[PDB]
């Protein structure tokens, strides 16, 4: 078929599975969330918590699906249909190494639901406690062993792919042990080889030798807020792509529709990026495509705390908060606008 509606398997959408309901999970997990103290606000702050009631959730927006559970198979079905609408072929699943049966259940449910719609799943390896290259290797082995034969497990030219968030928290000399073909605990040329995509944050003078010396296969930028880092400044993407191509690296810039996290970080208003009825998303996605990249990542499907989600949101005013909403656009606008950009990306590929 050549309908201009098929999934794109070089488009990765960051997905969060940490939402809970009292009924399914015992608590409205993540809809309830601690409010962060101001890191520049001095001592004795008592910022409190967002309780995750119907009226007061830990987002500046409000989900069309309500305070859902990430463990609810019926929600997962709906999410996969939303991925199909968006044409996003890869779900990049947050992974916190919780070592708990409820995590294991969720991951299996997500893989199963994804496969019904021919969506693929890869893992976004988060900065879990004491993360280091040895336990990373062990966890990569575990994930490939447990899930590598699942039909929804993502591969690119035969290799799994992992995104590594805050990869700068680990020195290049440690990464080399895992990721150089000669490394002490290498995955290269083993059953557990994978494309390892590190987080490019700051200036080229720092990031270029970091990526080379660490032996990452590529890099991504994550942040949905333009200008938050050098890497999330889209005017740098042409030059970042040129460097990537020269050095055999895969650049996967991250694009998002906006940013606002002031319910959970009230002091963080300088990072707000307004959606402007889709014009912000359009500008960022256009820059990624114009840079000539081979793959794009989307921040985010459903990071509701940070206001970067493309998942449908609805107008809502409760007695506790007046939420933002998609304004003049309909609740599914960011899904269908993603599909528009996926088509432009494919036309360019």
Ligand X SMILES: OC[C@H]1OCC[C@@H](O[C@H]2O[C@H](CO)[C@@H](O)[C@H](O)[C@@H]2O)[C@@H]1O
Binding site for ligand X (CB under 6 A): 14, 94, 124, 126, 165, 303, 305-306
Question: How many helices (H) and strands (E) would you count in the chain?
Answer: 9, 11
Cβ 292 to ligand X shortest distance, Å = 26
The label of the residue with tokens 């900065």 reads 127
Backbone angles phi, psi at 275, to 5 degrees: -75, -25
CB neighbours of 171 closer than 8 A, spacing ≥ 6?
none
- Cβ-contact 63, 312 below 8 angstroms: yes
Taking the least distance from each CB to ligand X, the nearer of 10 and 303 is: 303
Q: What CA–CA distance (Å, rounded) separates 128 from 332?
A: 33
Cβ 232 to ligand X shortest distance, Å = 12
Taking the least distance from each CB to ligand X, the nearer of 192 and 304 is: 304
Cβ 268 to ligand X shortest distance, Å = 10
Taking the least distance from each CB to ligand X, the nearer of 135 and 180 is: 135
Cβ 34 to ligand X shortest distance, Å = 9
Structure tokens at 176: 């080399």
Taking the least distance from each CB to ligand X, the nearer of 126 and 290 is: 126
Taking the least distance from each CB to ligand X, the nearer of 58 and 114 is: 58
Helix (H, G, I), strand (E, B) or coil at 239: helix
Cβ 158 to ligand X shortest distance, Å = 26
Structure tokens at 285: 């996605």
Q: Which residue is at the shortest CB distance from ligand X?
A: 305
Cβ 127 to ligand X shortest distance, Å = 7
Cβ 317 to ligand X shortest distance, Å = 23
CB neighbours of 190 closer than 8 A, spacing ≥ 6?
none
DSSP 332: T
**Share of the chain residues as helix, strand and coil, in percent rounded to the nearest 5:** 35, 15, 50
Taking the least distance from each CB to ligand X, the nearer of 236 and 297 is: 297
Taking the least distance from each CB to ligand X, the nearer of 193 and 256 is: 256
Q: 93 has which bridge partners? A: 15, 123
């Amino acid at each position: 078929n050549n309908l201009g509606t098929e999934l794109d398997y070089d488009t990765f959408c960051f997905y969060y599975d940490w939402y809970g309901s009292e009924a399914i999970d015992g608590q409205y997990r993540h809809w309830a969330h601690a409010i962060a103290p101001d890191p520049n606000g001095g001592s004795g702050q008592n910022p409190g918590t967002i309780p995750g009631t119907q009226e007061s959730i830990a987002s500046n927006f409000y989900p069309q699906l309500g305070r859902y559970s990430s463990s609810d198979p019926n929600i997962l079905t709906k999410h996969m249909d939303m991925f199909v609408m968006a044409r996003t072929g890869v779900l990049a699943l947050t992974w916190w190494n919780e070592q708990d049966e409820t995590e294991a259940k969720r991951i299996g449910l997500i893989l199963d639901a994804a496969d019904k719609k021919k969506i693929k799943v890869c893992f976004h390896l988060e900065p879990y406690p004491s993360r280091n290259v040895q336990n990373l290797r062990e966890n990569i082995v575990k994930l490939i062993t447990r899930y590598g034969n699942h039909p929804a497990f993502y591969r690119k030219d035969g290799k799994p792919l992992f995104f590594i968030y805050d990869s700068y928290l680990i020195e290049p000399s440690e990464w080399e042990k895992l990721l150089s073909p000669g490394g002490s605990i290498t995955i290269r040329n083993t059953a557990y080889d994978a494309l390892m995509i590190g987080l490019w944050t700051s200036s080229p003078t720092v990031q270029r030798p970091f990526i080379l010396n660490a032996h990452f296969d590529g890099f991504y930028t994550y942040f949905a807020a333009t200008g938050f880092t050098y890497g999330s400044t889209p005017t740098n993407w042409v030059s970042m792509q040129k460097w990537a191509k020269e050095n055999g690296k895969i650049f996967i810039p991250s694009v998002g529709p906006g940013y606002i996290d002031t319910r959970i970080r009230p002091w963080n208003g300088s990072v707000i990026r307004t959606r402007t009825d889709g014009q912000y998303y359009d500008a960022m996605y256009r820059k990624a495509i114009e840079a000539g990249v081979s793959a794009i990542s989307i921040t985010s499907f459903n990071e509701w705390h940070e206001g970067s989600q493309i998942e449908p949101a609805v107008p809502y005013t409760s007695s506790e908060f007046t939420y933002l909403d998609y304004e003049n656009r309909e609740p599914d606008y960011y899904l269908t606008r993603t599909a528009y950009w996926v088509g432009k990306f494919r036309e360019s590929k």
